[PDB]
Design a protein around this ligand. Structure first.
Ligand SMILES: [C][C]N([C][C])[C][C]OC1=[C][C]=C([N+5](=O)=O)[C]=[C]1
Ligand SMILES: [Mg+2]
Ligand SMILES: [Mg+2]
Lengths: 148, 151
């Protein structure tokens, strides 16, 4: 179980690094104790093994799966192109767009952890508990995933 | 129809929609459908997906210049087993000389299995199928769907 969790963290951070460097927008939500089946059902079902390659291919711009969220559950990619609720929080930086508001929005009604890559800057952020943690390095994201 | 038959129809619809989209856009593709001869040895050379089929995922896999696009997708029933898989290259002299590695790999796997492989040419957008060592070129959408339904 521990080896599997580490393999999944490595797959995620490799995909995030690829997308950050190319400023490919991405939205990846990891289900925790709050069930997210209602959101999973809005997307395209995958129930796929995690790999950095599949995560990258999903988010390539102008492709069927790239808009909306990937939702991971039980160490698999449950679905892609999923709807998440947009936060109305007035405390999100006004320079950020829909992916960030969707990530904060799901984080207000679940215990999930969501990773966002900005298409404008390639900056990486995480939404949890209604807050957005901006300006993350790879080491910082890894620390969050291991804590989670 | 039974659930198995309905699932088969959904899988055929997903495949044909994806192939049609890729053909129109000259997106090269190589898609092998396992039949009664097991293809585990080739599946194991790729990136494991074990994913539910959708036209959307098939398209996303083959987008040029992406991690998953080079090599074969291998399907088992209603699942995409793996992407970026190796297939053996045919040496058949009945492969049109202008065709490249995707068509030769398709004919190659068809010589050692009963699988059906679909190819989209990145040069012309033409759609072909390899089966039992033969390549059938320039298929219409209707002809592909009928071949899949018969398979
Ligand atoms: C200057 C920073 N920009 C270009 C390098 C984007 C940030 O670069 C990364 C941030 C986070 C991860 N990470 O969380 O894995 C990977 C790359
Ligand atoms: Mg876009
Ligand atoms: Mg002809």
């Amino acid at each position: 179980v521990e080896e599997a969790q580490q393999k999944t963290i490595e797959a995620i951070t490799k995909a995030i690094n690829y997308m950050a460097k190319r400023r490919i927008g991405a939205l990846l939500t990891i289900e925790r104790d709050t069930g997210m089946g209602d959101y999973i059902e809005t997307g395209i079902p995958l129930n796929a093994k995690v790999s950095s390659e599949l995560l990258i291919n999903i988010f390539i711009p102008n492709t069927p799966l790239h808009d909306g969220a990937v939702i991971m559950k039980n160490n698999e990619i449950a679905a892609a192109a999923c709807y998440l609720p947009l936060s109305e929080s007035p405390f999100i930086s006004k320079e950020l767009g829909t992916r960030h508001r969707a990530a904060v929005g799901i984080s207000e009604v679940t215990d999930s952890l969501t990773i966002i890559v900005s298409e404008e800057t390639g900056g990486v952020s995480v939404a949890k508990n209604g807050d957005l943690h901006r300006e993350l390095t790879e080491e910082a994201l890894k620390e969050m995933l291991e804590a989670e």
